[PDB]
Design a protein around this ligand. Sequence first.
Ligand code: PLC
Ligand code: PLC
Lengths: 61, 171
Amino acid sequence: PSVGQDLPPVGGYEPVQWRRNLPARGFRPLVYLAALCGICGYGFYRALGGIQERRELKREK
Amino acid sequence: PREAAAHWVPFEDKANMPDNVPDVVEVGATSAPLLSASYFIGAKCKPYNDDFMLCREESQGSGAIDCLKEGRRVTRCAVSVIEDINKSCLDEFRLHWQCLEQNNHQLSGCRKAEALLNKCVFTKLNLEKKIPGLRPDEEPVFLKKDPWIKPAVDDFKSVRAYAEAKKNGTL
Ligand SMILES: CCCCCCCCCCCC(=O)OC[C@H](COP(=O)(O)OCC[N+](C)(C)C)OC(=O)CCCCCCCCCCC
Ligand SMILES: CCCCCCCCCCCC(=O)OC[C@H](COP(=O)(O)OCC[N+](C)(C)C)OC(=O)CCCCCCCCCCC
């Protein structure tokens, strides 16, 4: 006889996760490069516009 | 032309200009009034300033003593400009150069008092502020709308006066 022991459930446990859970996340790399070139080029727009404005200010002074 | 360095000692001389040179009124305006009225003293006194520098060119190394007679007239006519701009718009001239006292005397930071002053002087002293060397299809920079370079803080008196001049319809 064996009373008072720990035993598994009669239906068993549910299955655990032992596979690798590494899902690929992010946009495509061409999306990040296109976004990079867009952010950069808009920055160059504002920067070179400000340089020309500062040149006209230097003319006035 | 070169800066004083390594223990320079300032000295003044209590002495007088000689008899043969007549007396001349000197300008008492300060850097923000002078930088304010710069374009209008350059508009009224173009040929006198030109006569002075052209004389100083033609008599090389003479320099000081031989074109003194003309450097009299440039100081006199610029004193005439600043007396007239005082008596015309003391308040708005004052608004302009008190704005220029802050912001490193940058002309970029005081557009809204500058518009008031330019209107008041063109209306009454009838001198116009222009930038030469500027070929057409090139907008002058103190006329443009939405410049890239805005000041850090608009001063309060000139924003209030600019809005009141909008409401009066004089602008
Ligand atoms: C506080 C502001 C922080 C800004 C983040 C720093 C700069 C941006 C870096 C780009 C990374 C990125 O956001 O890319 C977005 C992707 C999700 O897209 P996807 O599920 O893979 O589908 C793409 C399917 N395609 C390819 C077919 C189109 O990655 C992530 O969200 C992972 C979590 C990073 C969270 C960063 C916080 C921003 C909230 C985004 C919630 C969606
Ligand atoms: C290899 C580099 C190739 C560049 C090709 C891009 C052509 C795009 C056409 C837009 C031009 C435009 O319309 O923008 C003109 C702008 C703003 O000038 P503005 O003050 O508004 O003009 C008023 C004229 N005034 C001053 C006489 C009154 O000026 C620029 O400089 C911005 C150019 C866009 C930045 C491009 C940088 C590219 C990334 C380089 C990474 C190192």
